[PDB]
Amino acid sequence: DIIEESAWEALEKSILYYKGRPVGTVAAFDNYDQCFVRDFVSSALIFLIKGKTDIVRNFLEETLKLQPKDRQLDAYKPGRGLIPASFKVVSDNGEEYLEADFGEHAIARVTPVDSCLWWILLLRAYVVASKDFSLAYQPEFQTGIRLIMEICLANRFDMYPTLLVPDGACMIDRRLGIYGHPLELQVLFYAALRAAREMLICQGNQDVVEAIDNRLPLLCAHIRQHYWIDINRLNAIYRFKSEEYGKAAVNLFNIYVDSIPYYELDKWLPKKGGYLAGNVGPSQLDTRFFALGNLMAIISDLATEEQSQAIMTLIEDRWEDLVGDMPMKICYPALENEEYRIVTGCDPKNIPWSYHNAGSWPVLMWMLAAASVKAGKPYIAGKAIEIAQARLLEDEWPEYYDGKKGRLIGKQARKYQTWTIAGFLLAAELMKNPSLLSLIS
Amino acid sequence: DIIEESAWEALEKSILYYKGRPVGTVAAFDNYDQCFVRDFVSSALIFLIKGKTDIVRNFLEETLKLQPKDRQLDAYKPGRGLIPASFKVVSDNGEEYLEADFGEHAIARVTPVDSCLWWILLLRAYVVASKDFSLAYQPEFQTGIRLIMEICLANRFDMYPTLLVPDGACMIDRRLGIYGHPLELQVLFYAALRAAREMLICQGNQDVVEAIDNRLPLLCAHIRQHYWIDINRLNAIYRFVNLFNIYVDSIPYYELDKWLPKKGGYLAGNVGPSQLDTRFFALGNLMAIISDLATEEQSQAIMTLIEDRWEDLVGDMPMKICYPALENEEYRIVTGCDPKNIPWSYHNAGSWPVLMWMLAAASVKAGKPYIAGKAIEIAQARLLEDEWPEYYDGKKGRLIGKQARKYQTWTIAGFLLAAELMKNPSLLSLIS
Numbered sequence: 001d002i003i004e005e006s007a008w009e010a011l012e013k014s015i016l017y018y019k020g021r022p023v024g025t026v027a028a029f030d031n032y033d034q035c036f037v038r039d040f041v042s043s044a045l046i047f048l049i050k051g052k053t054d055i056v057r058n059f060l061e062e063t064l065k066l067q068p069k070d071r072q073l074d075a076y077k078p079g080r081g082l083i084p085a086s087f088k089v090v091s092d093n094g095e096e097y098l099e100a101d102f103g104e105h106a107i108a109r110v111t112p113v114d115s116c117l118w119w120i121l122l123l124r125a126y127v128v129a130s131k132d133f134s135l136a137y138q139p140e141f142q143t144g145i146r147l148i149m150e151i152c153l154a155n156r157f158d159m160y161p162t163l164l165v166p167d168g169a170c171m172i173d174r175r176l177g178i179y180g181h182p183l184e185l186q187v188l189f190y191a192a193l194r195a196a197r198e199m200l201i202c203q204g205n206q207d208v209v210e211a212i213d214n215r216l217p218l219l220c221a222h223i224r225q226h227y228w229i230d231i232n233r234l235n236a237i238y239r240f241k242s243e244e245y246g247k248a249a250v251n252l253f254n255i256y257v258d259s260i261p262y263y264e265l266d267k268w269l270p271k272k273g274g275y276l277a278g279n280v281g282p283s284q285l286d287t288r289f290f291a292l293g294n295l296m297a298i299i300s301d302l303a304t305e306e307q308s309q310a311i312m313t314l315i316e317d318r319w320e321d322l323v324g325d326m327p328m329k330i331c332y333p334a335l336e337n338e339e340y341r342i343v344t345g346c347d348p349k350n351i352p353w354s355y356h357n358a359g360s361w362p363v364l365m366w367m368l369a370a371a372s373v374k375a376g377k378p379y380i381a382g383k384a385i386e387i388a389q390a391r392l393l394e395d396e397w398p399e400y401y402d403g404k405k406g407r408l409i410g411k412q413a414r415k416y417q418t419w420t421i422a423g424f425l426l427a428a429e430l431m432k433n434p435s436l437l438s439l440i441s
Numbered sequence: 442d443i444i445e446e447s448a449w450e451a452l453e454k455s456i457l458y459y460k461g462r463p464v465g466t467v468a469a470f471d472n473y474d475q476c477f478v479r480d481f482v483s484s485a486l487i488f489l490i491k492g493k494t495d496i497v498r499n500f501l502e503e504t505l506k507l508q509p510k511d512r513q514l515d516a517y518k519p520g521r522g523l524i525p526a527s528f529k530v531v532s533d534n535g536e537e538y539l540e541a542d543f544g545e546h547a548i549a550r551v552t553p554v555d556s557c558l559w560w561i562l563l564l565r566a567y568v569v570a571s572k573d574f575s576l577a578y579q580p581e582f583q584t585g586i587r588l589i590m591e592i593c594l595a596n597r598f599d600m601y602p603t604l605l606v607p608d609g610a611c612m613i614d615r616r617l618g619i620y621g622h623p624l625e626l627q628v629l630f631y632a633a634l635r636a637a638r639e640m641l642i643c644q645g646n647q648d649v650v651e652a653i654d655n656r657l658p659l660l661c662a663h664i665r666q667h668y669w670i671d672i673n674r675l676n677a678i679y680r681f682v683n684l685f686n687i688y689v690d691s692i693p694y695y696e697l698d699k700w701l702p703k704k705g706g707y708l709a710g711n712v713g714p715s716q717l718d719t720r721f722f723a724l725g726n727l728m729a730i731i732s733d734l735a736t737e738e739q740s741q742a743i744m745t746l747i748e749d750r751w752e753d754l755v756g757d758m759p760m761k762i763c764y765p766a767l768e769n770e771e772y773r774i775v776t777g778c779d780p781k782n783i784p785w786s787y788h789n790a791g792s793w794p795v796l797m798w799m800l801a802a803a804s805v806k807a808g809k810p811y812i813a814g815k816a817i818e819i820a821q822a823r824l825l826e827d828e829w830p831e832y833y834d835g836k837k838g839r840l841i842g843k844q845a846r847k848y849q850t851w852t853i854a855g856f857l858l859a860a861e862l863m864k865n866p867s868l869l870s871l872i873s
């Protein structure tokens with residue numbers, strides 16, 4: 001009805017032009033010249049679906065040129081192979097050019113890792129939508145893919161098959177205790193490894209293609225075995241006799257059982273529910289539920305079929321906790337009290353049930369839809385869309401919502417947030433046509 | 442004297458042999474075949490002081506061979522350029538060989554970063570003691586230094602001049618909230634940068650030598666500005682443009698104001714976006730004085746703090762590895778309820794006699810050797826009696842550590858080294 005029409009009209013106005021050609025979308029239409037890579041994913045997929053592919057092509061070509069190609073030994077300059085979080089059009093010189101934001105002057109001088117992984121997934125989306133892999137096989141694209149894989153695969157100090165990162169290195173780009181091996185990045189890493197293997201010419205690239213082939217099954221089993229939480233699993237951990245000869249090594253990360261909030265999880269988890277943990281590392285298990293990681297795990301077949309149904313069962317049965325009045329919680333539960341202070345450093349923006357700290361993010365509804373369709377329960381997404389439809393247009397498409405139920409328009413939420421609009425539309429498109437999953441799986 | 446002679450005898454026994462020549466010392470003499478790089482530092486320095494340099498030369502050569510030379514894309518294999526935390530002699534096969542431990546089957550599959558930085562500092566110590574840079578100028582050693590500098594300098598995701606690391610990546614090799622930019626590693630990185638600049642030939646190493654020269658003053662200024670804690674700084678945080686957004690509610694600011702003397706201060710345990718770790722870490726602060734990372738005024742202010750809060754930082758056993766202990770929710774959240782690191786035990790503000798040598802070195806450097814003198818007198822009163830334990834527990838370090846090994850080599854070496862540095866201040870040239 002009028003809701004979808006208004007969304008389309010809004011999405012159109014968000015398009016960003018460079019040298020007269022569309023090169024992405026702005027984060028929120030009112031800088032006026034700023035495209036975020038992660039934000040562009042939902043817009044991009046819509047445009048692909050609607051056959052307007054040139055915007056995506058131009059985005060991929062332009063961002064590829066922004067990727068640092070050489071090893072970087074100097075402070076405050078981006079690491080080799082990274083994709084910037086955002087870029088903008090600088091019209092101030094006689095001629096237009098693009099300026100990358102790698103975070104060099106940001107409040108955290110960290111380059112988020114998700115952008116380069118989404119870039120690969122977008123590249124695959126484009127070639128599948130175009131029914132033509134030619135772009136990907138061009139030498140500059142082979143190089144781009146290869147460099148991203150190298151920085152992700154190469155071991156530095158940490159040798160787990162997962163990707164080790166500083167805090168605030170993904171969609172959650174502030175301090176939320178997601179340093180280490182956060183789920184979001186491992187899941188994207190897995191999906192990107194799969195996508196890169198489909199598009200890389202193996203000849204000449206033997207080292208990297210081999211490393212990709214070696215990493216995929218190790219990373220899959222690692223995540224399935226060491227991130228999976230359900231009631232059976234938690235009880236098995238508690239009864240596990242670690243002192244017995246040869247059983248210590250089973251507890252790979254040397255998790256101490258006393259650290260797990262059993263009472264609260266036992267209560268929260270449905271009988272047949274479960275999910276992948278937010279983070280796992282030495283003496284570290286973050287039992288927060290993170291939506292993006294869990295939903296993307298379903299979409300990429302990282303989660304087993306049984307795990308996927310368990311995740312969907314959790315979402316259905318704890319619908320009020322995870323969706324409430326606005327799909328959906330970025331994570332659950334909130335860090336509060338002492339834990340909030342220690343983990344976030346008292347970040348004012350990240351107070352309990354706000355923003356990154358278990359705020360509700362409409363954009364996540366596109367992945368909820370994709371996952372629901374993939375899991376054969378598309379009615380779950382339908383229900384989420386109905387809830388969103390009730391308030392998004394009236395509220396002028398906010399970036400996020402706050403509170404345990406997502407009742408409040410986010411404390412500092414921008415209006416006409418593009419991924420809120422695109423997330424909404426994309427969810428609806430995936431419902432109408434489940435076969436569109438092939439763009440992202 | 443008698444006590445030194447007694448320590449010396451214990452130290453001689455800890456020597457590890459490989460193919461009939463000394464290649465290091467074991468961590469605690471009774472594995473019987475195992476040498477830890479960081480533990481060996483105090484042993485090595487004593488041996489250098491005593492003119493027994495071949496053990497250190499052999500140690501350096503053999504650990505250099507254990508360094509991975511190429512890029513590593515496989516899981517559970519060590520990163521390029523790293524030095525293993527420890528090695529052991531396997532005499533089980535026909536002919537003895539060395540086996541590196543990079544943490545591949547450890548409870549934390551993380552290769553500690555401090556080992557490679559100590560290796561650089563030991564190399565310099567050796568060529569200074571030998572008055573000959575020949576060993577360091579050999580191509581394989583030039584390569585060794587370059588690789589270490591490359592892996593530390595190279596930005597991955599984090600672009601600060603500091604070194605970004607996982608938790609448990611140094612002497613504290615368990616989870617203690619020292620992920621990010623912990624002081625210990627920043628100070629050792631700084632110290633290793635200085636030593637690498639002094640030993641790397643510019644020709645053939647142009648990119649890395651320039652990057653070292655650029656990083657040095659930037660890292661120096663970064664630490665001096667952003668890690669420094671004193672009354673004035675706390676008030677500035679309270680009144681907060683700045684590089685780091687630090688929110689004052691995140692730190693115990695009224696408590697710190699009370700703890701700090703007027704002319705006291707120290708370098709913070711960790712600094713990052715929305716992160717200021719106000720714990721005092723001893724190794725980091727003492728090595729910062731020794732390496733001239735801390736300014737003269739900061740050095741005196743650290744010494745003023747140690748004197749004035751002696752009961753807290755030294756107590757009955759010099760000296761606390763950090764202060765204060767993580768307790769209550771902080772302990773549970775930060776350590777993951779690690780039973781070994783309970784408050785006032787082991788890494789969690791336990792008392793580690795090894796730190797004595799750095800207290801001595803820093804005290805001499807700051808022209809206040811009587812500070813180390815007082816610590817030595819206390820340590821002397823208990824270490825020989827207790828047979829050189831690894832660590833002590835309790836708010837005042839009164840208890841022998843529950844799992845402390847006796848005849849812990851760096852406790853013995855640390856004590857002797859402290860005494861040597863007191864007798865001969867110019868020996869500081871070995872470590873700075």
Ligand SMILES: OC[C@H]1O[C@@](CO)(O[C@H]2O[C@H](CO)[C@@H](O)[C@H](O)[C@H]2O)[C@@H](O)[C@@H]1O
Nearest residue numbers: 027028036038039085170171172173174
């Ligand atoms: O308002 C943009 C500003 O917010 C930050 C900090 O959270 O990032 C947020 O906004 C981005 C653009 O919409 C999102 O991609 C990101 O997930 C979200 O955290 C800053 O990074 C950015 O400068």
Ligand SMILES: OC[C@H]1O[C@@](CO)(O[C@H]2O[C@H](CO)[C@@H](O)[C@H](O)[C@H]2O)[C@@H](O)[C@@H]1O
Nearest residue numbers: 468469477479480611612613614615788
């Ligand atoms: O007993 C050796 C065993 O102890 C650990 C515990 O973390 O490390 C400690 O002992 C090492 C050897 O003396 C020290 O170098 C280290 O600083 C200390 O934490 C294990 O890593 C090691 O396997």
